Write a structure and sequence with these properties.
Belongs to the DNA polymerase type-B family. By secondary structure, the protein is of the alpha+beta class. It has 26 helices and 33 strands. The structure holds 2'-deoxycytidine-5'-triphosphate and calcium ion (CA) (5 copies). It binds a DNA duplex through α13, α18 and α26.
Length: about 900
Amino acid sequence: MKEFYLTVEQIGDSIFERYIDSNGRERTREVEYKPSLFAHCPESQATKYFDIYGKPCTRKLFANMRDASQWIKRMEDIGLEALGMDDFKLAYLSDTYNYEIKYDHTKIRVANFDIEVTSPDGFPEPSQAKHPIDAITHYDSIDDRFYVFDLLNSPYGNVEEWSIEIAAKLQEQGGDEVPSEIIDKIIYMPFDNEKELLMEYLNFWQQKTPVILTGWNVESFAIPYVYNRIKNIFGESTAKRLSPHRKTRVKVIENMYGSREIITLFGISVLDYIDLYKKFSFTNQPSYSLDYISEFELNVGKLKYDGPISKLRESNHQRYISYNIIAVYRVLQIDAKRQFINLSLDMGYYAKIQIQSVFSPIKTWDAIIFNSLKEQNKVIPQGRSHPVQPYPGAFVKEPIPNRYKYVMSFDLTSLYPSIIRQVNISPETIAGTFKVAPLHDYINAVAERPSDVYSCSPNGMMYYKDRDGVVPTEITKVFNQRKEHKGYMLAAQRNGEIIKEALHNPNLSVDEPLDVDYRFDFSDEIKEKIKKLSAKSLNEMLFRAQRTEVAGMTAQINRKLLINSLAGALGNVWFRYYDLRNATAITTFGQMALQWIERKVNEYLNEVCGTEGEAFVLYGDTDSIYVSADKIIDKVGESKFRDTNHWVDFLDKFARERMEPAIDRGFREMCEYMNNKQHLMFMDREAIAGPPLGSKGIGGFWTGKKRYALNVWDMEGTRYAEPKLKIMGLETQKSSTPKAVQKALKECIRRMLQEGEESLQEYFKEFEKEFRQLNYISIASVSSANNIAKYDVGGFPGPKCPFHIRGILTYNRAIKGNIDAPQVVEGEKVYVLPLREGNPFGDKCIAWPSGTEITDLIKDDVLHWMDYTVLLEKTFIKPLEGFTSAAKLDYEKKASLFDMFDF
DNA sequence: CGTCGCCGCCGCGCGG
DNA sequence: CGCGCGGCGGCGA
Ligand SMILES: Nc1ccn([C@H]2C[C@H](O)[C@@H](COP(=O)(O)OP(=O)(O)OP(=O)(O)O)O2)c(=O)n1
Ligand SMILES: [Ca+2]
Ligand SMILES: [Ca+2]
Ligand SMILES: [Ca+2]
Ligand SMILES: [Ca+2]
Ligand SMILES: [Ca+2]
């Protein structure tokens, strides 16, 4: 096989590399790497090295890496550019793997661990590590085993050995319900004392050194606790055995709310799963405890136990160990579904970076662009210093607040990356500038043509047309990858709806699910067989369809994130290729393109309908337009349609056969006007929305910019078995809105769009009646706990104190001087509740850490002094009033002359 | 060390 | 709670 790296580090003048050799053996080597950097040289001296502008460069080969660094400093003192890759490990990887990396994940050691630390005096601070480590479960991906290190004797209690037999048993048999599929994979090791536990763990680690190290909060907790505890017991040299090169760095993260210290283990790539989840899941969660994320992702119930975790080991050691094993497995299960490790390894090897650098698109693109340029013997420019400067972004149209019955949306494929490709925006393709006219003059095609030679954006920039820049070239490759995976995702989605349809008529038999590839549209043979399957098999197929879909979603959306981050990076001062002319060229073009096509679409439909001045486009944001289809439906008449699916086919055909060709023509003209290199403005139909035929539903509504709801029947080719609510921006989509309120507001919207005014008033009335029975967590608001100290004036709210911060301070006073109580962590999330006047807490609100039941100390008083009326008004009624007034509805029945005839 | 646009809640200081 | 500005948090793109 072709060799690939595992990890790479620079230590002084050595490169330390772990890698997989041509036989699939893990190896390590130390190389005295001789780096090269570059200087501009006279036009009249032979060289094969040129900077990106075509200026000749001389290569300077250095005796060692320190010399190279010191030369960079001298070139600064002199005032001349030091060109080339100044991150020497990236240049090493590029020299060593001068080919597309083919990696074998089965040779990479992925380690997933969690630790337990009993602590009576509150949270066990990793930097202190003053409490014994009493459990480690370490899963190894190569052995496929859960190694459990269990401490039997501790100053906090002596316990009996854990029992795998009891752990396997159902909770109803008194067992711990450890999933049977891993029971055979557990290697259990009990220990008489902590010292031997840690010594054996270190020896284990040495034999089975993690390449990728993951888990839940391992970066902020497990890793530093283990490192510091070993350090405190044995000394630094022993702690440093966690690094395969015996080098660690104790270094803080420079934030704006305080400071926390993480431990950098040279020769390991730490991918804390929480950080992977936060960057790649496209969620914002009320809580980031593993219980909460597990239940969301997997639908598994919380781990239930009695008393505080600080007493769990001594009261129930059996469960303590089992829950530690289960926590590890749960991360693996989340990964089996989301596939973030896979994504990371894919991006990492593609860019040729340290795997942990996937968190940094700037580092990712810097390496991609450097490898691409190096292939042509080109030299990257030195990074420069820039002041942070604001710049303009996308265009958003002000919608007329209203209900909208029939709506077709259109959307541009990868807008910003397509603009980069269409215009040829790259650092080395800049050709000059033209005299800009006001934007609406380009929008309305009255401005003079920018250039007869170069490719332009309405911000004034011109670009070469003879050859593609490295930014367009490289953004295209990843764009193309994205498209493949999106194709897989959409097909899995369409396949899911076929299974849903079949579930309405399940057969009564014993059978198996079909062995099919869910990434491809089902054949007719597969479709027929599905129609003959039981509910059990169809459900299992649906589960697999939905899993295939999620896999495609991870792969496609994060590739989209990466390419959109390149466009963004152009506006970040730390990007080597930072240039505001280029960032603005993208965003201004976008503003033009959206408003241009609004004008064209209107002009087209006005002509089609025989009118003048009618606004068919009701809304637009960045790259999408929303078109009123009322008149189109009306031109044939509703009475001519058999059912909903009929008008949906009607609009699907109108959008694809009439609108898209006109939209294409409009953009082709814009490309010529701007003289662009390639026409890549592809606007396809996205959504078809409307009320169920024969119903009183309103179909959709907007309340303002970025706030709207639609009843969707078809979304980019997927015909739903059941209509789907597309809701953007409204309170149902916000993590800050109480769970029960999101649910209830959603049903109100469902009722408005699908059923009408009368059904809406039925639901509201009932919800207002029963509201007070709701569980307090389901009705608590959520917020982030930022800058608590800033607004803490001796335990009481300072000036301008935010509502949620007040709640935290109320909380802090109520738990004051209790070590056992959960502390609110700066920057983490809190549940928030209003309090009725005259409550013992002495303030109007209280906040506690999210994902948790509030400490038993104050729970009773919170539930008794909870202000339901305020709660109902603030989070439910006000947003609903917002929806209904925008939609011209009433949530409460207005009095009529019909009152009353019952007498 | 990917980006900007813009929403609603809140405290504040009005607003004769 | 009528009004706007600035802090904030958070979402849409
Ligand atoms: N995080 C993001 C998301 C969006 N945008 C910009 C770039 C996008 O091109 C444009 C529209 O975003 P979309 O959500 O519509 O997605 P794309 O058009 O990029 O891709 P696609 O529509 O094919 O999924 O907005 C951005 O700058 N940063
Ligand atoms: Ca735990
Ligand atoms: Ca788009
Ligand atoms: Ca699309
Ligand atoms: Ca059937
Ligand atoms: Ca869009």
